Every structure is written in structure tokens, then in C-alpha cells.
Amino acid sequence: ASMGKSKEISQDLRKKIVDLHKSGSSLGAISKRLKVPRSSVQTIVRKYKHHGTTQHH
């Protein structure tokens, strides 16, 4: 095999922001600590809503 370990986007943040959106009352909590910008939350909601319908894996 070969080597090469790198990352691109925080997978945790991506799952977390989505999961917390389903919680609702805990959204202000993560937005308090990490204060996610509008552009970031607006872009991830598109992906979530998109993957909501036939989530390819």
C-alpha cells in the first residue's frame, strides 16, 4: 500500500452541526462556542437537505 494521511474538512463539525439542527434547543450552544458563520450553516443545510433525499453512500 501507500502512505499519505490528510484531511480536508472537520467531519465532526459537519455531523455535529447537522445533528444539533435536529435538536434545535441546543443550536445556540454550539453557535456560542464555535460561532458558526451564516455562510457555513447555510451551505451545510443545503447538503443535509440534499442528502436527506436518497443519501448515497
Side-chain angles (χ1 to χ4, degrees):
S2 304
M3 62 292 297
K5 187 182 193 62
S6 298
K7 55 189 296 180
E8 188 174 284
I9 310 176
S10 179
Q11 191 179 151
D12 177 73
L13 181 62
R14 302 179 72 179
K15 304 300 296 181
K16 184 164 59 197
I17 186 64
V18 171
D19 184 76
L20 272 298
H21 279 320
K22 311 298 292 187
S23 307
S25 306
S26 307
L27 188 280
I30 59 170
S31 307
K32 192 71 78 295
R33 300 181 62 211
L34 304 179
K35 58 279 296 184
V36 183
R38 179 183 300 190
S39 188
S40 299
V41 63
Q42 193 275 148
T43 43
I44 59 87
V45 293
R46 292 185 178 210
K47 267 61 193 300
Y48 173 50
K49 185 171 61 181
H50 185 89
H51 289 234
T53 49
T54 55
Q55 183 184 271
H56 62 103
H57 190 261

